[model samples]
Target: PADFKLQVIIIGSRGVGKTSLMERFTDSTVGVDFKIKTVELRGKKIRLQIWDTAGQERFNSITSAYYRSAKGIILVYDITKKETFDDLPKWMKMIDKYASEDAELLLVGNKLDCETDREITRQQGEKFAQQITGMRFCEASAKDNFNVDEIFLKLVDDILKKM
Candidate 1:
């Protein structure tokens, strides 16, 4: 379909709920790799190509081409697991090594519903987002659907502005 197309990819260390985030957003069983969803912003229909790194692709194994056309990259970390947050920099390093210069980035402290189990602070998430190269950040729960939609809404909003 003809549209203002936006390509986005989701990546994180294993168990960061990367697939869960996509599932909740798409409201369907996500495939092993990608999905296409369309949304409108300011009367412009935007087609979204959302991708998930498959098992073998979870590490630095993903090809540069996978990240090449992505205008938005959602880097997720589980708030309940410090290790996931600790591993985020690895993901960031790869993005820095592969993606386009203007590709948008979003850092999410996922699983807000697990606040009782949370190990990462929103303030720190704020700080990382601030310190990173212009990445947008937020806390969300893919399970409870908290701020899930806005994840793309905010990223796409920024991507459009930069276009």
Candidate 2:
């Protein structure tokens, strides 16, 4: 029998590595544009579907549409940008408004490989995570092909662990 079925949704503000995270997890590839995509991971007949959301303000209404069906949510932000970090609260507000209270949340600080331009630190990201949702944390960089996959893998494992 199948052991589990889960829906994980990856969302965040613009240029936060949401799309790359999905690409790395789904196809092990990265592209040069922004769009919404969905992929499924088949594990011993237990299918886990993940949705990657577009962060444009225009898609804000449509993006949260996937929230209700999500068992887990990954909220990512650019580590080199402060506005992206500041927008964390608004992201959490959407979770409160759309997703159930029990959704497993992961606050991600993407683009950690760029040390020179990094405006936000790990402490800041985790502090924001603790303040808003008290969720787990993952720092990643899609350009360097690092931790990008680990973030999704870790979240998937973490979610499975609790189940």
Candidate 3:
């Protein structure tokens, strides 16, 4: 038998719009604990099992050893708050500890609709993501439904392409 993989996770400090972004993108719930979407990558179709309410917040919670199956991890941070952006390194450290090295990262600076209140610059995120090989970054707004689709699409495209 051959090996196959597919799962995505959204992680960030509390109140960074992680849940809103997932909800906005997936649009419906299938797993109660997860949101599901089917996407065609290249020529073959694949189902993206996206984790929602997955206890990334409750780090010590029943966890179910979550994220080990994560092929693409979306790391989100609030654009309006410097504190959330400040915690990304810790989250990345946790990813290093928990996620598969094969995991592709999409560092999202959320709350673009509130850009007037922004503290973090797009250049900062871009530079940070560039520092890590294969990591990508973008600014999006869950409230405005902006770039939410491309966020998952781009990441999943790489996931399937990697295989």
Q: TM-score winner among the candidates?
A: 1
Supply the global lDDT for candidate 2.
Answer: 0.75
| Per-residue C-alpha lDDT of model 2 across residues 1-163, encoded as one tens digit per residue | 4466678888889888787777766662221232332323445344567777768767778776788888788899998999998898788888999997778888888887887899998898878778764488868888788886667666666666676
Candidates ranked by TM-score, best first?
1, 3, 2
lDDT of 3 by residue, 1-163 (tens): 1133378888787788888998898775322267777776566677778886442446523332566878898989998999888888877787887888888989999999998898999998999899889999999999999999989989988787787
Error of 2 at 35 (Å): 12
Which tens-of-lDDT digit does each residue in 130-158 have in candidate 1?
A: 98879999999999999999998889898
Cα-based TM-score, every candidate: 0.91, 0.82, 0.87
Please state every model's RMSD to the true fold in angstroms: 2.8, 4.9, 3.7
Preferred candidate (lDDT higher): 2 or 3: 3
C-alpha lDDT score of every prediction, in listed order: 0.84, 0.75, 0.81
Residue 126 in model 3: lDDT:
93
Clashing residue pairs in candidate 2 (N, C-alpha, C atoms within 3 angstroms): none
lDDT of 1 at 144: 95
User: Candidate 3 overall Cα lDDT vs. reference?
Assistant: 0.81
Query: Which portions of model 3 miss their true places by more than 4 Å?
Result: 1-5, 28-32, 53-64
TM-score of 2: 0.82
